[PDB]
């Protein structure tokens, strides 16, 4: 019974491999010979946000490119005004460990998650004048690794028990569940149209999920180690992943395989966060060796380097209008690069 | 109007700064412990006497201690343990004695010690179930270890009264198996502090305290380039 199923699975894998090799007509690094180089991108530090006591673990820009949420391990969640460097809100968390934080598209809600297995959604309206827990969600059995707001009432979450969830905030119940991974699920990224999303796990595979249907469509296995970062290309039809193997990879949703690999022989450190720019020509990757490399996303050459941090870069965010790039590291500082 | 907003947000900034300057003192005063142990080993008795994560908050000699018990997690530690590179000490609890659980404990301690993000944290080590070792001398360690026979009891480690010398030899052998791992790398950044404990004991809390101070003292002596 097991032999006829395992051999069938091997046959189907070989069929998919042969379909991919059949559709491999050429590479991205061949049709991009006559493209102008991006030159030397020399970015400068314009601000330095200094309020956190412990290491900063995750951050998220707001949709107005004005406010950003930063989450530390000291139990504080701080909302920064990026222009004037004034702290607008400081929220004390019930647990000490935080792994994710998200700022809602409308600016009304802030969600945070950590080892506590409970995703806390805070209402920033506060007609009383003080922040308050709107609703805490407790339906996971591992640890909450990443969460993202689809809209005001729906939030997608990633857990460390190999499953992803979709919540309804008003009821507090799980609308559906996503069960396809065989390892810890590290991070996820939402498409611009909020129709599909990707999930990267610790089995070196990335799963493309349909939010409304509840099934996965595609499985991308181009990596050698655990995938930490995952970010959609600005048109929603490609995405880049950052693994511990020290290589970045660019995948496609229609060619159903990798287009290009970003690697350099002098880099043996893991990747902790990636994010594309507004146009998509630059790909920013935060590495474990205390700096962020600015890769040319169509030539696989380093446009530049952001060597401002003194400890492991943990999170990286690009504004919705591309005006600035904010990076957060374990030295408890937020550098806003021009 | 443009000045009122830039006054209101200045006052909001000052209030948040005062709150973080009253919380920084608390965060800097309280010490943090990670109570990491195997399931077979009795860390439940330890949490009693001494969701996803559990927390114990206590104080000894006007010193605050948060101790964190990893609760309902997954067996894959390589990701969430990277949240713990800022605790002041990892308390590691193992039960001396089915599989070879001691070897699994050795491998876990080795992975903790060699880990890149856990090279600057010290480990406090409890060897539990010291009574069952005494009760096993008349009825396993030799079978799973080919080096137990070619081993003598330390000339420089004194044995407590009323202990069968075979049991002291087994104790010090088990200790030295963790010590060879901790002295192997020898970077000179962190130290391993082994202890003994019964299934029911009360000195444990005093022990941890008398080692956490030592860790803090060694940290200051690293700053002045003396050790």
């Amino acid at each position: 019974e097991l032999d006829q199923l395992r051999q069938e699975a091997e046959q189907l894998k070989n069929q998919i491999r042969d379909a991919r090799k059949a559709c491999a007509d050429a590479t991205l690094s061949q049709i991009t010979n006559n493209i102008d180089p991006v030159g030397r991108i020399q970015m400068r530090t314009r601000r330095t946000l200094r309020g956190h006591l412990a290491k900063i673990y995750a951050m998220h820009w707001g949709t107005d490119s004005r406010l950003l949420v930063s989450a530390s391990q000291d139990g504080k969640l701080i909302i920064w005004d990026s222009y004037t460097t004034n702290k607008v809100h400081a929220i004390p968390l019930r647990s000490s460990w935080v792994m994710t934080c998200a700022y809602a598209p409308s600016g009304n809600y802030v969600a945070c998650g950590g080892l506590d297995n409970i995703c806390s959604i805070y209402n920033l309206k506060t007609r009383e004048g003080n922040v308050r827990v709107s609703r805490e969600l407790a339906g996971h059995t591992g640890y909450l690794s990443c969460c993202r707001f689809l809209d005001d009432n729906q939030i997608v979450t990633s857990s460390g028990d190999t499953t992803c969830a979709l919540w309804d905030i008003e009821t507090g119940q799980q609308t559906t569940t996503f069960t396809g991974h065989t390892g810890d699920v590290m991070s996820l990224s939402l498409a611009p149209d909020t129709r599909l999303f990707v999930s990267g796990a610790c089995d070196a595979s990335a799963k493309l999920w349909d939010v409304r249907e509840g099934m996965c469509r595609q499985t991308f296995t181009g990596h050698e180690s655990d995938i930490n970062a995952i970010c959609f290309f600005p048109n929603g039809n490609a995405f880049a992943t950052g693994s511990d193997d020290a290589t970045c990879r660019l995948f496609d949703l229609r060619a159903d395989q990798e287009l290009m690999t970003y690697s350099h022989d002098n880099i043996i450190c893991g990747i902790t966060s990636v994010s594309f720019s507004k146009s998509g020509r630059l790909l920013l990757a935060g590495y474990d060796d205390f700096n962020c490399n600015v890769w040319d996303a169509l030539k696989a050459d380093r446009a530049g380097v952001l060597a401002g941090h003194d400890n492991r870069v943990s999170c990286l965010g690009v504004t919705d209008d591309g005006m600035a790039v904010a990076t957060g590291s374990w030295d408890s500082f937020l550098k806003i690069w021009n | 109007d443009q000045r009122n907003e830039e006054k209101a947000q200045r006052e909001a900034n000052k209030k948040i700064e005062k709150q973080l300057q009253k919380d920084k003192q608390v965060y800097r005063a309280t010490h943090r412990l990670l109570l990491l142990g195997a399931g077979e080993s009795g860390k439940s008795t330890i949490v009693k006497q001494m969701t996803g994560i559990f927390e114990t908050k206590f104080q000894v000699d006007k010193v605050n201690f948060h101790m964190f018990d990893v609760g309902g997690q997954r067996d894959e530690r390589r990701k969430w343990i990277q949240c713990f590179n800022d605790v002041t000490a990892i308390i590691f609890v193992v039960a001396s004695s089915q599989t070879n659980r001691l070897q699994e404990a050795l491998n876990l301690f080795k992975s903790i010690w060699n880990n890149r993000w856990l090279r600057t944290i010290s480990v406090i080590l409890f060897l539990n179930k010291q009574d069952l070792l005494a009760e096993k001398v008349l009825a396993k360690i030799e079978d799973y270890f080919p080096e137990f026979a070619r081993y003598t009891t330390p000339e420089d480690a004194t044995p407590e009264p009323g202990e069968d010398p075979r049991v002291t030899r087994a104790k010090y052998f088990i200790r030295d198996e963790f010590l060879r791992i901790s002295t192997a790398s020898g970077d000179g950044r962190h130290y391993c502090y082994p202890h003994f404990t019964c299934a029911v004991d009360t000195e444990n809390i005093r022990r941890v305290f008398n080692d956490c101070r030592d860790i803090i003292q060694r940290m200051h002596l690293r700053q002045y380039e003396l050790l």
Epitope: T162, D226, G270 | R74
Partner: nanobody, 126 residues
Framework: QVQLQESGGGLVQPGGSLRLSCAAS????????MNWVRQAPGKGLEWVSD????????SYTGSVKGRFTISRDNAKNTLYLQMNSLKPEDTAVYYC?????????????????????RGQGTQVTV
């Protein structure tokens, strides 16, 4: 795609000798520390032995120390295990396991909960 394919095994008599192989396909084999894990019938996963990247540093579990010989071949991309003086207590399913990260010293690969980086296994019975 990281894939590991164990080779060798079978029913053997005690006091004999047997070799195993691990075909490592889809990754840079030279940069990963690797090891052997076994599952005794009705028992949990227990660590047997390991080998570093270069092959200099080798360690064994005590109960089989001096009885097994682990060796990696970076030329042909294969992990090679020799087992002499076999014992009736050494029957198990054998797993060729890889450490998750490159260029490191620590590993976390005793997890029975579907650890992704180990092969399907081979049966050794005495």
């Amino acid at each position: 795609q990281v894939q590991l394919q164990e080779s060798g095994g079978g029913l053997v008599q005690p006091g004999g000798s047997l070799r195993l192989s691990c075909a490592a396909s889809g990754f840079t084999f030279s940069n990963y520390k690797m090891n052997w894990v076994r599952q005794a019938p009705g028992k949990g996963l227990e660590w047997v032995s390991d080998i570093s990247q270069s092959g200099a540093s080798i360690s064994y579990t005590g109960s089989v120390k001096g009885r097994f010989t682990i060796s990696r071949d970076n030329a042909k991309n294969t992990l090679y295990l020799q087992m002499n003086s076999l014992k009736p207590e050494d029957t198990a399913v054998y797993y060729c396991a890889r450490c998750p990260a490159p260029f490191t010293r620590d590993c976390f690969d005793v997890t029975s909960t579907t650890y992704a980086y180990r092969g399907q296994g081979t049966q050794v019975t005495v």
